[PDB]
């Protein structure tokens, strides 16, 4: 029969199944819409979370002083070392041509090894006579992305020399000029100030803090059962009706909480600065 | 189907040596339905039931289709629906009388779901073009009528063929 008092569902079904993320680095699943009248620019960057503080800012409406929590994302410049071109196929997007630089350093080829200290470092032994043929087929692409890696050794607090590699879409005009910019930027660093600016909204993609196997009260916020409850209070009591004779996937069960991929929209950049300058 | 003229009478006895001879013109599938449609009319017009009927003659009325033109036929019929019994008058153009009633049966079945046994024909008269009452059959009585074929029809039995092959023409 009908439940006596109605209430919203505990937790979103949009994020169920709550599984662990497949990686710690998340690739951009969707870049912004490429506008040919826009100038050539990159669309993403890869930063590292340093910590939080709060700023005080004047909120003009009369002026009222407000304080707001901010968070500081350390962004060493990313080195562009490859180009990936895509074509619009009736099955979707397809790799048209991958063009790498002749130089791949010890940081970014640490990523290609599981145990690097025991390795022989022979990845990417790799001709420059085929560049113009590879640039020409790359000009036939529909979507141009650069292969950029992070410079994780520049942080030095993270005991990680192994770099994070990702594709960043080159948005601008006339795919000819996209790869002419991209071959210019091979083995060059891209600053965070070149990609973003202050008071603009960005989307952050990352993996949450892992909480391990958690019960339903933390995982979903279901009500703790009363004090008299035999066999446990931090539960959902009825996990399903008699029919259907299975448990639905919509019922909150105990499992993995945290270490999920999350994309948060419209995070405003308050300040872009350098950690050395005051 | 076929047309039958079935002659019959009461079986002659010592009391009635020459009974009155009757005949019925039936459009039937065969002679056994034609005997059956004759026996009901002797049972219901007169009171002669089928045990006391002798069927004197059954002949197939067949037309000579020597030069085979199309005649017009006006058919007065009585058909029984699920709801009642009604009179209808239908006009057809056909080859023979026995083909025109086949056009009657396929039309009453298509338009009214009247089965062949649910239909009794009052009269079938071959008509002039001037005496036709249906304007649809009048259109084809005009000389020099012409129309094209717009339905596609295949020129063989095919399961799969290449694209270039003509199949309709």
């Amino acid at each position: 029969s009908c439940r006596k008092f109605e209430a919203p569902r505990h937790g979103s079904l949009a994020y169920m199944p709550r599984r662990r993320a497949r990686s710690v680095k998340q690739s951009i699943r969707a870049f912004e819409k490429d506008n040919p009248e826009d100038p050539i620019h990159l669309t993403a960057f890869y930063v590292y979370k340093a910590g939080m503080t709060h700023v005080v800012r004047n909120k003009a409406m009369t002026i009222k002083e407000v304080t707001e929590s901010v968070t500081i994302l350390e962004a060493p410049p990313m080195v562009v070392f490859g180009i990936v071109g895509y074509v619009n196929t009736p099955q979707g997007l397809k790799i048209n041509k991958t063009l790498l630089s002749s130089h791949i350093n010890e940081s970014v080829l640490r990523r290609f090894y599981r145990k690097f200290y025991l390795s022989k470092k022979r990845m990417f032994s790799s001709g420059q006579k085929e560049l113009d043929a590879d640039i020409l087929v790359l000009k036939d692409s529909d979507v141009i992305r650069v292969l950029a890696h992070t410079q994780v050794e520049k942080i030095k607090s993270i005991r990680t020399k192994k770099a994070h590699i990702s594709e960043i879409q080159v948005n601008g005009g006339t795919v000819n000029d996209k790869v002419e910019w991209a071959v210019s930027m091979l083995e060059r660093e891209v600053k965070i100030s070149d990609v973003f600016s202050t008071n603009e909204f960005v989307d952050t993609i990352g993996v949450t803090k892992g909480k391990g196997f958690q019960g339903v009260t933390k995982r979903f916020g279901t009500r703790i059962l009363p004090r008299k409850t035999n066999k446990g209070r931090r539960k959902v009591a009825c996990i399903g009706a008699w029919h259907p004779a299975n448990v639905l996937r919509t019922v909150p069960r105990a499992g993995q909480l945290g270490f999920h991929r999350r994309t948060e929209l419209n995070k405003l950049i308050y300040l872009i600065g350098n950690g050395k300058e005051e | 189907i076929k047309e039958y003229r079935i002659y019959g009478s009461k079986m002659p006895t010592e009391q009635e040596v020459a009974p009155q001879i009757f005949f019925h013109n039936v459009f039937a599938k065969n002679e056994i339905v034609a005997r059956s449609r004759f026996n009901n009319l002797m049972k219901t017009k007169y009171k002669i039931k089928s045990g006391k009927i002798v069927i004197l003659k059954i002949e197939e009325l067949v037309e000579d289709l020597k030069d085979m033109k199309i005649k017009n036929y006006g058919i007065q019929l009585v058909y029984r629906s699920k709801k009642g019994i009604h009179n209808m008058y239908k006009e057809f153009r056909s080859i023979s009388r026995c083909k025109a009633v086949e056009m009657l049966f396929n039309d009453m079945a298509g338009r009214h779901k009247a089965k062949r046994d649910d239909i009794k024909i009052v009269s079938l008269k071959e008509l002039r073009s001037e005496d036709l009452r249906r304007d649809r059959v009048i259109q084809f009585t005009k000389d020099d009528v012409m129309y094209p074929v717009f339905k596609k029809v295949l020129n063989s039995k095919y399961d799969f063929v290449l694209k270039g092959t003509n199949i309709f023409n």
Partner: protein, 97 residues
Amino acid sequence: KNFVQVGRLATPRFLAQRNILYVITDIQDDSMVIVQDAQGTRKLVSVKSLHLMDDVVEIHRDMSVEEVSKKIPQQSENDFERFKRELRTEIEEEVLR
């Protein structure tokens, strides 16, 4: 666009029976039509069962069977003859080299 009219030549719609000529002698309705064979026999057929040829023959509504059959235009293989046929193309492809 070939029309169904009296005097329009026709053949059976099947390709294996295209050797037979018909001529439309009378029109019943949208769908049925009397055709006359070159052998003089007439039969009522469907319009869908015919493939209309391009030619129309000078026939009017009430003509005799002999009168229409005057105006209809006039219309096997062995293994050895098939061999002689296939050998002809056998050499014909060799000359083109």
